[model samples]
Target: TNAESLDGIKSVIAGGVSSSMRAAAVPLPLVVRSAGGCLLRDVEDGEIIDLNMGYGPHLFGYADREVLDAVADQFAKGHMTGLPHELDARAGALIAELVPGVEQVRFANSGTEAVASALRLARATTGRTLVVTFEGHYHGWSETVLRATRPTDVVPGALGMIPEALAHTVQLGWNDPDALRELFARDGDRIAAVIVEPVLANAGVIPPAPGFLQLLRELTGRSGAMLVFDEVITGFRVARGGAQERYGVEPDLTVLSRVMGGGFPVAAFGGRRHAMRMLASNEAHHAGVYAGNHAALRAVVAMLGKIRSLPDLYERLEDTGQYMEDTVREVFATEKRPVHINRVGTLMSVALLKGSAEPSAEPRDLRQLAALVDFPRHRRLQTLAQKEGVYFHPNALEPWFLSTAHTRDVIDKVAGALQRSLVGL
Candidate 1:
């Protein structure tokens, strides 16, 4: 396999020439020559079925023709002008139309930047300092809100994080309404906003406990604090309107990325008219050198237009997701494996557990079951899946993403590989 050939190349390119997650025992990341739809052709002269979907960006699949054409068209005119363009306005308008509860939008380069900007806006608008987030809910890798920790002892990234900016942040557990309420009652006046991933994708596709979002809204409203939904993973991928529309919950502020760019590096953060007005004022500064570059705007316009015109795309995604989930569950059930699978729209995960699956009946919490998984065994299974031409995210805590490019054949292939991988364990 070319995996060995690339090992030396990766070593010279700093930390194996890829992200930390890609630095797996496989020794080298797959050097892809090209990809289209659901298939990836690696430089190793191998063809693999891709289920990672670029960590949830390839909603319509890699190098989608429409998005590619849009990029080319924009390039023909000019990629960037270092100034605003109609494309930005058009993209923002489309986002407002597609994303519910978002009255306005501002473009950014990545999810991390969008989230950081949103947090700053929340503070500026509400004149408060503290922001409350949940454990296992990853907003981004920013200094202010990189508070990914266990629910109990969250002391500003005690896990090797050196950011003092996290001091104003509070981390709590998902589905713990009492903890949230207690915090709000204690420091509601000091908190500017409560930020959360509406669907909690980082914790493996855990949907909100019924009415948990509503409770958050009510609590934040009562305390005059804004509710910010960090929909980086779920936006546009879950549905056209994202998780807010799917769950029928509204947030005062929303941060979006991933599928919004149609495989390009584009993201946005916007919400209520009053809250978003901070961007227009000199009192709050939010500017980026390439915030609304033409290349990203063109992609956003093309992707949102296609999603609106082809309503069946989302339906098909949901259907395919259901097929995958059902097949995986059946595999585990037959083995009598103490595993629980959770799904919300197109996102899903397989969590190893003990005893019956009844404990999983509640809102899924990856931290709660972190100790249950055998890391070595999981790594072996991942390697086996890769050998079988199936590619998945390296982290067990993250949910698997499905794309429109996935077909029934690909789904069956993944199921077969998954079953084979689990048998030895």
Candidate 2:
């Protein structure tokens, strides 16, 4: 029966999709037949209220009219020229205007590619190779930036990585000012950059603690280390300028994607003109065959224009998110569940703790709690939610993405389903 629904997908595609992230515990991914305006129709003829939002795209909702029109118009003219197009200039302009610290930008094919480029540029500009990254902060899948200290041991993931590359990177804890300062004090000159997710949405919506981001900016500036904000998840979703605008903090370099492409595969890395200028010249070779394809550039222009014109859209999204968070808290309070709800703008996460609420919280950091995530319980709840007609990302670590297309009524439905699921637990 399952095979009948996933027939088309299994026959031609390996693992039924390109990314392993999409593989659910059902042993196969749902064959999405079609999607439109915050709803997805799966091949099994099921309609699910989408909370994944295309892994953070579909910000304006699936197949947004304006975004689709932009792509269609560009396709009517030409698809690709293998040369620069005006659309690239327009997209870059939009990014510079919206993102606070992005004075110039270079398009890329994916978040991984963008982060890779940003890391290379940081090394080149600072003439240093050491990059200080936070634990559980996923910049990308690139091996260069994937080095990290295991939760059990404060050792970097240096086994298979090039020794020189691993030696150039350091891992530290998030929200720990003293640890960061101490690291810089010891090897400030050797560290080329400090890369982090401004909002830390990857491992749940962990917003920067008060003064944490400010401290990072100040410390990095004092140490001559470039600060890189990986905004792949937060960019254009939290605010027009991403976490930078939302928190009034700036980074030396900003890498972004997910929402910027408007469902297309596009990303960008940009920052101070001095650093970005390196990419413009032949000095730093950054080239891709489809980096600024007409479809992607046009979609970005339309998406950015829409976001600019309708700033209230983000407000609506935030309101929905707040409502969901409040609803979850209210429901869990009744059950006296050991849970912590964290939220930032349209992103929200529910951390299920092991004990009842108590005074003087002893919270677990990403590294400490990495292996504690109950995958079976999370999958059970996720499957239950899907059965109730609401769909979220299968991974418990990822944020629950809310979209502008989701109305208060839709949120109410989701909250009701979530309440029922929690009660069952």
Candidate 3:
């Protein structure tokens, strides 16, 4: 029986988990045995309310019927055919319908692949090698774009990355309009693209400041550089169409995944026809054997269809998310602890304050978030939460994500856990 459970986890799997960082924390093991609508069941019979939702992909919930029915129907026909099918057309058309700037589309297996494709297209179309991205945004782990995802102001990309990987790129602070304006005026023509995460969700739920996104769009438009939105975290989660729909600023290329795939591994990049023409002319190659696997495409069709059909999905997500936010505030106020929480739709972050000073209204960028987070204290609270049957990503910088299946009752349970968790931290 132990062999069928957590005892057998590390024998074959590299870290008893997929990502090392995912399981390397106080709520150790990260070994999930099973999942239901909004709960994770561990091998030891521990049931915890799930807030990560596979890192924002399971917006509809675990084993969601809307996704499973389409996937099962496709599995009956065939899962992978090194051949094109109607589902591909339907999926592509749906992305085009939602993203105002996506006139044509290409599929990939994950967010990384989509980012790679988008960057390649950007460089090819602009005939430039340099790319400009912000500090807070993560544009996948492609060798060249891996830098500045965290608070890497002193250095470029991650170490062990070749020195040249840092070259041909400029990293600027998020929400700092002056820095962007200065960079664009000095070397705008030398840049191929300006890529961003419109919401900067990966860096702790930091929203774009007023006119920040608009300024990026205006500068990129003036400089003849491409604009790319890494919506892997926000796509279909922030709004039906992602941050672009929420903010009204469009990008030249849209990289989509996560919620768009409905807990499956699927991603896509799409943009204007002229920008994507390189692929058509064999100039920029977009190829992968499993790029548009039948099963994944079926899931995409189901996810986008369900998102389109549910007109009030965002409203419900916001209302419930708001309830959780207010509850956390009450917990902190009752305990007299300084806490800063930011909520944008279903995504929220509960960060314990490190500074003795008053908590700011909200963090404007990753650097600010990096300063405010008390990582060790946050980990302690997370450990306490796990003991109380509530679970989330153990990292302080990572935001809490909710799914459509999570109700106010679930929020009440999590809030109580937070209330108790505050006592120790």
**TM-score comparison, 1 vs 3, better candidate:** 3
**Model 3 lDDT-worst window of ten:** 148-157
- Candidate 1 clashing pairs, residues 3+ apart or interchain: none
Best by TM-score: 3
Distance from true location, Cα of 119 in model 2, Å = 0.6
> Mind giving the per-residue lDDT tens digits that candidate 1 earns over 1-425?
47665776766877674555456535325777889888899877788888777778888788899889999999999888988788877898889999888888888999989988889888988989898888788877778887533585555543567656787887888888888889888888888999998988876777888889999999999999999999999898787899899889899999998888888998999886777887766577677898889999999999888888887878888898998888878877777766666777678776665453354454446565465554555566677777778777655666788887787888888888778777866
Top model by lDDT, which number? Answer: 3
Better of 1 and 2 by TM-score: 1
lDDT by residue for model 3 (1-425), tens: 32355447667777656665564642445467789899988777778888877788988789998789899999999989979998989999888887777878888999989998899899998899888888868887778788643332525545578878857777888899988999898999899999899998887888999999999999999999999999999988898889999999989999999988898899999888877889767789788999999999999999999989888989998998888889889988889888888889999887888756357656688777777777878788788887788887778788888887789888888888878777766
In terms of TM-score, how similar is model 2 to the real structure? 0.92
Residue-level lDDT tens digits of model 2 in 196-312: 999888787778888999999998899888999999999998887899999999999999888888888899899978767777675875778998888888988998988888868
At residue 322, candidate 3 shows an lDDT of 87
TM-scores, all candidates, are 0.93, 0.92, 0.95
Cα shift from native, residue 396, model 3 (Å): 1.5
Q: Give candidates' CA RMSD values in order.
A: 2.3, 2.7, 2.2
